[PDB]
């Protein structure tokens, strides 16, 4: 741990500075260092962790998609052989992506999830576990693809079960979990009907609970509801 000599509070401060500077790789390294101090994370700290890694992995996924598209074109009938470079570089980006996902999954397993007892933390971490298994599934092509898919599904399902028992239907973590599990169904598990059903049921149940919310909570919940509707519009 290169961050082992820095105070936990200094790591959190620097993560916030790195965010302002759009240095998300630094942000993620600082938050990994903070997690490795061994104390549970507050709400704000959990979101700093997730923002950092989402930005890092998101850039890697975008690059992998560009490279995969070029590679599939080099493999069409009538393309000019270019040698191994496209495959090799796609593999390099893929391996770095897998490493980031393994790092995040490792932090969740050592020991964020096992110490998370409140629904807001436990659902958040299990959603992340499903998300990072989902990113692994996006690039998986081997003996382990089915097992990676089932690991994502299992994490999302445990998060869903807790969220339905312990959170209101408008809770933004519950909504974002459902949004992402719906995407898992559509894009990973070849279950578009389940994806659509989940998005629509989640939206309708949240709609009926908006009346209980303050103006600020209403803004937070309806923002995620709009993403559910956006996906439903894309899919129907």
């Amino acid at each position: 741990g290169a961050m082992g000599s820095m105070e936990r509070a200094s790591l959190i401060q620097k993560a916030k500075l790195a965010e302002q500077a759009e240095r998300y790789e630094d942000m993620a390294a600082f938050m990994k260092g903070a997690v490795e101090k061994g104390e549970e994370l507050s709400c704000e700290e959990r979101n700093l962790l997730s923002v950092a890694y989402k930005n890092v992995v998101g850039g890697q996924r975008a690059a992998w998609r560009v490279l995969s598209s070029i590679e599939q074109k080099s493999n069409e009938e009538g393309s000019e052989e270019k040698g191994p470079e496209v495959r090799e570089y796609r593999e390099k980006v893929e391996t770095e992506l897998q490493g980031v996902c393994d790092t995040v999954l490792g932090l969740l397993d050592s020991h964020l999830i096992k110490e998370a007892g409140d629904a807001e933390s436990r659902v958040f971490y299990l959603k992340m576990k499903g998300d990072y298994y989902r990113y692994l599934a996006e690039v998986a092509t081997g003996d382990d693809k089915k097992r990676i898919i089932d690991s994502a599904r299992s994490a999302y399902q445990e998060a869903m079960d807790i969220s339905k028992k312990e959170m209101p239907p408008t809770n933004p973590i519950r909504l974002g979990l459902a949004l992402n599990f719906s995407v898992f169904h559509y894009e990973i598990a070849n279950s578009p009907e389940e994806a659509i059903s989940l998005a629509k049921t989640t939206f309708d149940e949240a709609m009926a609970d908006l009346h209980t919310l303050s103006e600020d909570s209403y803004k937070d919940s309806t923002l995620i509801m709009q993403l559910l509707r956006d996906n439903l519009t894309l899919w129907t």
């Binding site: 974002g176 949004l179 992402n180 996906n231």
Partner: peptide, 5 residues
Amino acid sequence: FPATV
């Protein structure tokens, strides 16, 4: 690509 958060 669909929206995720």
